[PDB]
């Protein structure tokens, strides 16, 4: 039912944006069909974790506060696709980093996807009292992610920034704000229950959940094989500021740091394997278990602090934090 | 006085955005100074024709309708830098089209510049009654330009679209909406005189002025030498849908079209020179003079239709259409 409605609203969103181009933007059918295939390629395929999070938070606040139900759930789906389209916009910008018409179309696709988040919001929320509030929080969160991408890309140019606090800074701005905090806020906006929740505790929960999931992704990037991870682990080659790096540098000897610095960031298969051996010999995956446990217990505690003033809100977070575990 | 105030507001805008990053975004001084040098590089340098247009329209409506004067002119400068920053955002995206950290920073710069237009608007216009109206027209015009870039980049893939009406479609969406229509509207918004002007006639004036200036740029791209034009003429090599191409194809013989199609879009110096020879032998620069004259007379006529309901508005357009001619 949640996914079946989310995909049905996608059809409603897509046919509006494409008809608007046809009727109000002088676009020819060939380019309309081209943009249909592009929209389906970049936006459809993922697990829709950010989009469905908005709907799961919205439906809890309705029955735990009737034509208002039909409107709030539809607004949640539009806000859900605003994030998914924004995610597609970020992914397209990532493809460019790694008279050529195929690169011009990639840049133009990234601009179109980002603009479509504004267009679907300005249309479906034209008579909603929160259109100005939603667009401002959406723009600021987008600005936050761009700042977070600067912290990550330049985390090795100016190993001084390989610290646990700067790692949190990267995860906070680059990932946590738009993946965890943004969908939760959108569930409170369409339900008209934003000032009824502790924003500080909700903020703190989003950063901790982002930290938990980013540490797990860093370990899986290095140790999970390609066929089981779904991609190729590239953090060691790209010299990223991963949780495995900042944890190793703290508990490594002066020689292990020298052997780490002389092999990190290289593309050579043997230098990358040398980095994995140091991670293995340092018992980092033993520290990974205890680190995620302490973070998980912080998530369990702050959910209780939020339910004293927002019971149904924490119920969605519990089911969303629980999920596949 | 206009430029001296415009640059002074730039200092006010820059120091806010950089301090906000320092105070509210956990940014270190090194990256703050990096973003200062990036902001000055991409935004400062041009002639500021779009930004100053907003101020010239605003100051006319004040004296031709006193603490309100100081506020409207400051709002005009902020709107002026919103367009200039948006122009820098488009230029940065153009540099990308023609683990590499220098390309990641270019993409990140394009996202930051675009986000800065929202941030300066959400701050300086926080208590203005037109913040929601301004952001929506700004976003739609930005969406319009992205659509116009699709018409231009794909104007030779799907010589069928080399027609005078499709050329106007490219100029209208890619250039005219944000270079001419957008600054004029921003002068009416900060002056609170938007519904007091004929939007249709104002729209028609912006498209005609964009058409006049785009035809002149196409001819200069092909005939003006590099040291006098300021760049290198690349339209013939890039196989662009320029005014010289669509005019030639109409008045060329069946052999001249064959000789044009077999040499257009190539990078060979002799094939490009063959295209220029056909443009010369077709007496196109004789048609260019009469074509700009007919367009110029349309601009002179529609200014009069607008002054019957907006005298001071047309006074700025006359001085702005007059300018260097
Ligand atoms: C977006 N999302 C699911 C995703 O982050 C989990 N994941 C996927 C890959 N690694 C971790 C999510 C959103 C809100 C809440 Cl409360 C909980 C989870
Ligand atoms: C932006 N601009 C000046 C620029 O277009 C002229 N130009 C520059 C290069 N080729 C042509 C402008 C804006 C509003 C009006 Cl009403 C008139 C002119």
TrEMBL record, chains A, B:
<dbReference type="Pfam" id="PF00348">
    <property type="entry name" value="polyprenyl_synt"/>
</dbReference>
<keyword id="KW-0808">Transferase</keyword>
<feature type="binding site">
    <location>
        <position position="95"/>
    </location>
    <ligand>
        <name>Mg(2+) 1</name>
    </ligand>
</feature>
<feature type="binding site">
    <location>
        <position position="221"/>
    </location>
    <ligand>
        <name>Mg(2+) 6</name>
    </ligand>
</feature>
<dbReference type="GO" id="GO:0004337">
    <property type="term" value="F:(2E,6E)-farnesyl diphosphate synthase activity"/>
</dbReference>
<feature type="binding site">
    <location>
        <position position="217"/>
    </location>
    <ligand>
        <name>Mg(2+) 5</name>
    </ligand>
</feature>
<dbReference type="InterPro" id="IPR000092">
    <property type="entry name" value="Polyprenyl_synt"/>
</dbReference>
<feature type="binding site">
    <location>
        <position position="217"/>
    </location>
    <ligand>
        <name>Mg(2+) 7</name>
    </ligand>
</feature>
<feature type="binding site">
    <location>
        <position position="94"/>
    </location>
    <ligand>
        <name>Mg(2+) 3</name>
    </ligand>
</feature>
<feature type="binding site">
    <location>
        <position position="94"/>
    </location>
    <ligand>
        <name>Mg(2+) 2</name>
    </ligand>
</feature>
<feature type="binding site">
    <location>
        <position position="217"/>
    </location>
    <ligand>
        <name>Mg(2+) 4</name>
    </ligand>
</feature>
<feature type="binding site">
    <location>
        <position position="98"/>
    </location>
    <ligand>
        <name>Mg(2+) 1</name>
    </ligand>
</feature>
<protein>
    <submittedName>
        <fullName>Farnesyl pyrophosphate synthase</fullName>
    </submittedName>
</protein>
<feature type="binding site">
    <location>
        <position position="217"/>
    </location>
    <ligand>
        <name>Mg(2+) 6</name>
    </ligand>
</feature>
<dbReference type="GO" id="GO:0005737">
    <property type="term" value="C:cytoplasm"/>
</dbReference>
<keyword id="KW-0479">Metal-binding</keyword>
<dbReference type="InterPro" id="IPR033749">
    <property type="entry name" value="Polyprenyl_synt_CS"/>
</dbReference>
<feature type="binding site">
    <location>
        <position position="152"/>
    </location>
    <ligand>
        <name>Mg(2+) 3</name>
    </ligand>
</feature>
<feature type="binding site">
    <location>
        <position position="98"/>
    </location>
    <ligand>
        <name>Mg(2+) 2</name>
    </ligand>
</feature>
<feature type="binding site">
    <location>
        <position position="235"/>
    </location>
    <ligand>
        <name>Mg(2+) 7</name>
    </ligand>
</feature>
<keyword id="KW-0460">Magnesium</keyword>
<dbReference type="InterPro" id="IPR039702">
    <property type="entry name" value="FPS1-like"/>
</dbReference>
<feature type="binding site">
    <location>
        <position position="98"/>
    </location>
    <ligand>
        <name>Mg(2+) 3</name>
    </ligand>
</feature>
<feature type="binding site">
    <location>
        <position position="94"/>
    </location>
    <ligand>
        <name>Mg(2+) 1</name>
    </ligand>
</feature>
<feature type="binding site">
    <location>
        <position position="221"/>
    </location>
    <ligand>
        <name>Mg(2+) 5</name>
    </ligand>
</feature>
<dbReference type="GO" id="GO:0045337">
    <property type="term" value="P:farnesyl diphosphate biosynthetic process"/>
</dbReference>
<comment type="similarity">
    <text>Belongs to the FPP/GGPP synthase family.</text>
</comment>
<feature type="binding site">
    <location>
        <position position="235"/>
    </location>
    <ligand>
        <name>Mg(2+) 6</name>
    </ligand>
</feature>
<dbReference type="GO" id="GO:0004161">
    <property type="term" value="F:dimethylallyltranstransferase activity"/>
</dbReference>
<dbReference type="GO" id="GO:0046872">
    <property type="term" value="F:metal ion binding"/>
</dbReference>
<dbReference type="InterPro" id="IPR008949">
    <property type="entry name" value="Isoprenoid_synthase_dom_sf"/>
</dbReference>
């Amino acid at each position: 039912m949640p996914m079946q409605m989310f995909m049905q609203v996608y059809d409603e969103i897509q046919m509006f944006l494409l008809e608007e181009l046809e009727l109000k933007f002088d676009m020819d059918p060939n380019r309309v069909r081209y943009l249909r295939k592009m929209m389906d390629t970049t936006c459809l395929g993922g697990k829709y974790n950010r989009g469905l999070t908005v709907i799961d938070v919205a439906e809890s606040l309705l029955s735990l506060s009737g034509a208002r139900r039909k409107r709030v759930l539809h607004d949640a789906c539009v806000c859900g696709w605003m994030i998914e389209f924004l995610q597609a916009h970020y992914l397209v910008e990532d493809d460019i980093m790694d008279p050529d018409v195929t690169v011009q179309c990639a840049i133009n696709d990234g601009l179109l996807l980002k603009s479509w988040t504004h267009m679907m919001a300005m249309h479906f929320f034209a008579d909603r009292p929160f259109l100005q509030d939603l667009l401002c929080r959406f723009n600021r969160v987008d600005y936050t992610t761009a700042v977070g991408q600067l912290y990550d890309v330049t985390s090795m140019f100016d190993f001084a920034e390989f610290t646990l606090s700067n790692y949190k800074r990267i995860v906070k701005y680059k990932t946590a704000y738009y993946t965890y905090l943004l969908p939760l806020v959108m569930g409170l906006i369409v339900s008209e229950a934003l000032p009824t929740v502790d924003m500080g505790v909700t903020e703190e929960l989003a950063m901790l959940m982002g930290e938990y999931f980013q540490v797990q992704d860093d370990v899986m990037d290095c140790f999970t094989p390609p066929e089981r991870l779904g991609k190729v682990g590239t953090d060691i080659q790209d010299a990223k500021c991963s949780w495995l790096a900042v944890t190793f540098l703290a508990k490594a000897s002066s020689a292990q740091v020298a052997e780490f610095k002389a092999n990190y960031g290289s593309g050579d298969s043997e230098k990358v394997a040398t980095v994995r051996r140091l991670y293995e010999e340092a018992d980092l995956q033993g520290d990974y278990v205890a680190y995620e446990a302490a973070v998980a217990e912080q998530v369990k505690e702050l959910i209780e602090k939020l339910r004293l003033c927002s019971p149904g809100f924490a119920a969605s977070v519990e089911t969303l934090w629980g999920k596949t575990y």
